[PDB]
Write an enzyme that holds these catalytic residues in place. Sequence first.
Site, PDB file in Angstrom:
ATOM      1  N   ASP A  78      -8.748   4.236   6.128  1.00 49.21           N
ATOM      2  CA  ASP A  78      -7.316   4.466   6.026  1.00 49.21           C
ATOM      3  C   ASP A  78      -7.141   5.518   4.947  1.00 49.21           C
ATOM      4  OD1 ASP A  78      -4.424   4.025   6.621  1.00 49.21           O
ATOM      5  OD2 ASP A  78      -4.408   3.624   4.462  1.00 49.21           O
ATOM      6  N   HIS A 125       1.809   0.971   1.706  1.00 47.14           N
ATOM      7  CA  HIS A 125       0.886   2.052   2.064  1.00 47.14           C
ATOM      8  C   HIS A 125      -0.180   2.311   0.982  1.00 47.14           C
ATOM      9  CE1 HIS A 125       2.887   3.124   5.796  1.00 47.14           C
ATOM     10  NE2 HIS A 125       3.955   2.598   5.194  1.00 47.14           N
TER      11      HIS A 125
HETATM   12 MG   LIG Z   1      -2.899   4.759   8.071  1.00 43.52          MG
HETATM   13 ZN   LIG Z   2      -0.464   3.585   5.076  1.00 44.48          ZN
END
Ligand SMILES: [Mg+2]
Ligand SMILES: [Zn+2]
Lengths: 148, 180
Positions: free
Chosen positions: B11, B158
């Site tokens: 990620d 995030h």
């Molecule tokens: Mg992502």
């Molecule tokens: Zn994210």
Amino acid sequence: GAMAQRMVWVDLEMTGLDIEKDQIIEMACLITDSDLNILAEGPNLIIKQTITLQQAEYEFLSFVRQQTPPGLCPLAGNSVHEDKKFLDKYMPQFMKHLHYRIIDVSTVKELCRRWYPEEYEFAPSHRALDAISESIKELQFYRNNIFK
Amino acid sequence: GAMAQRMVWVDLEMTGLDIEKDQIIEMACLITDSDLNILAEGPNLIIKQPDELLDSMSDWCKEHHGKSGLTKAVKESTITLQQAEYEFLSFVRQQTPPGLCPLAGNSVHEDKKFLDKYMPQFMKHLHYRIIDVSTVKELCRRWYPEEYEFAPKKAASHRALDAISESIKELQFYRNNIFK
Ligand SMILES: [Mg+2]
Ligand SMILES: [Zn+2]
């Protein structure tokens, strides 16, 4: 509902995988419903380096505008992440009509290979439109053989 | 084959979705085996980027990265892009054979776009194919609507490490409920 759950299938042929130098040589597009039944076939265009890139984009955008609602339906195909990279660069107005997510058949293949190796062994092109038809058959095969 | 069937989960967090302007501000990596069993947690690095780029970010970006504590952590970082690439490449070289394991995550094609540009040596260690959990999500939504409603909502802000663990949980959820 069902309309937002349609899929925008594509197949592209490029000179290579370098986004900075390679170009799109061929492209085809078609729409399926959520269950992979073909609703409409779009054009199969050979792009110059027959038609120009900008006109192919107009032809494809007009075709999906009359078949899917704006920004809802994902791009679908075999290793379509490769296709999306070139479409984001060379057909940004066509991509504005679609969702950012993809239905990548080769992701499903990587899961079939790992989790269902026996089914993977018996899993099942002159035009890009023929490659789309083959990718739908591969995806339908995983639906029937490895999904619940 | 077992080592070649491992998955390289990633990620990224960036300053926006413009590949021509935006940069990578956070990265995390995790290794699973073929069956989604947790093998190893990799680095979780916040990459130093200019203050001009950070102040000129999107309203969505400035708020989410501000509230999560990422913008502050980027401004105080001493890790360059090249240093982060070396750490991630070193980690995946210890975990997987070269050019055989796929990049894995939610709509990980977007992360791949940034990694192909900013960490090409890291991408060269991985295979061509990806494992996009959001493809399985989109098929679940359509073909298994009941099961789709039971999938847990993404609870993470995030932050790369938390987001990537949630992607594994999501694909594990599909393996457990919509696969044969
Ligand atoms: Mg992502
Ligand atoms: Zn994210």
